[PDB]
């Protein structure tokens, strides 16, 4: 039971989560053939009975929490309807219930932060642009089934209700097992990388006084290797989680010009592009493309774009808010990423400095700076506490904070040089 969680290397709860995500596949062996089944109320009943069992198996307490939010949300589907208050109360209540969970390692708030976004998204869908005219829904079991879907429950991607009901019917396409193997084999490849790296390079090492004053160059060097190997826990649990999502048929975006079907519908990653990438505007734009696209659809699209940027990323700090740490992380995308784009336009688009720096002559150095850019930003994540976060930040001479601002004052004068 617990000896399996100690034998490989990972945490005790981490084994119960990987078992839960891998449990998606034998459960997707029923939507293999019983999906073409004429009865649709049986499909909704499968997701509830599986999702409630998955929630109970991982944590006994959560089964009531999610269920309570689900019944209260379809109560705001009866009352209020699409009157504007309904969006205001859903946004507040869901975050009020969510933030209560944090105030009261792998807690029951793991699938709860997912359904919070799934129910807020449902409210705006129940409430136009070419995307909005499609994503909007028309007109009990529907809300319960959509929330408890086994493929995307613990950390899975948000899926449009309109598109979810489609899965019960025609999934909006040919059934396949070959792409499912692709995201599973690549998903397990990163699991081997994580389980082997995590013990010889850990978090508690950053706060440990041992050697944490000796090198300076390796002081930042450890921060480059770490926060590149730690985020692989998310990577493995988004590729194996997509593997079940695509096996059912939900993973299919559509088809292309050659008739070949598309697979990037609920794809929360793009590996060749989130790695081997010199410019991290690609990586940070959307490492969790779905988690990033949701905010870009229901927060940024709904929201004066200049004043929207701060309030949209502030919602991501209301999303968890464990310590000031998670807030300091979202003020990195609105920091280095906006500065990185300024250096992108500094070259090829300036009448002073770009002229000489536009050419092919004017790779490894950029990536080395960009992996450092990630680590420094992931430091106030994992270790979120004020005393832990400040400890390693002051020990590394606060380089990221100084360099970004140093670039920010000098940069507009380089545009003149």
Residue numbers in the entry: 42 to 145, 152 to 174, 183 to 194, 198 to 230, 237 to 367, 372 to 430, 435 to 489
From the paper:
Combining the x-ray crystallography and the cryo-electron microscopy, we determined the structures of LPCAT3 in apo-, acyl donor-bound, and acyl receptor-bound states. A reaction chamber was revealed in the LPCAT3 structure where the lysophosphatidylcholine and arachidonoyl-CoA were positioned in two tunnels connected near to the catalytic center.
Overall, cLPCAT3core crystallized in the monomeric form, and residues 42–459 were resolved in each protomer. The helices in N- and C-wings tilt to converge at the cytoplasmic side and thus form a large cavity embedded in the exoplasmic leaflet of the ER membrane and open to the ER lumen, which is filled with loops and Ha-f. The structural analysis using the program HOLLOW40 shows a “T”-shape inner chamber enclosed by TM helices and Hd-f. In general, this T-shape chamber is composed of a “horizontal” tunnel parallel to the ER membrane and proximal to the cytoplasmic side, which connects with a “vertical” tunnel at the middle point. The horizontal tunnel extends from the N-wing to the C-wing and its tip in the N-wing ends at a gap between TM1 and 6, which opens laterally to the lipid environment of the ER membrane and thus might represent a potential gate for the chamber (hereafter lateral gate). The T-shape chamber is empty in the crystal structure and the analysis on the Fo-Fc electron map failed to identify any non-proteinous density. Only crystals of substrate-free cLPCAT3 can diffract to a resolution beyond 4 Å and co-crystallization of cLPCAT3 with either LPCs or acyl-CoAs failed to generate crystals capable of diffracting to 5 Å. This non-contact dimerization might be mediated by those intermediary lipid molecules and the relatively harsh detergents used in the crystallization trial deprived the cLPCAT3 of the lipids bound, resulting in the monomeric biological unit in cLPCAT3 crystals.
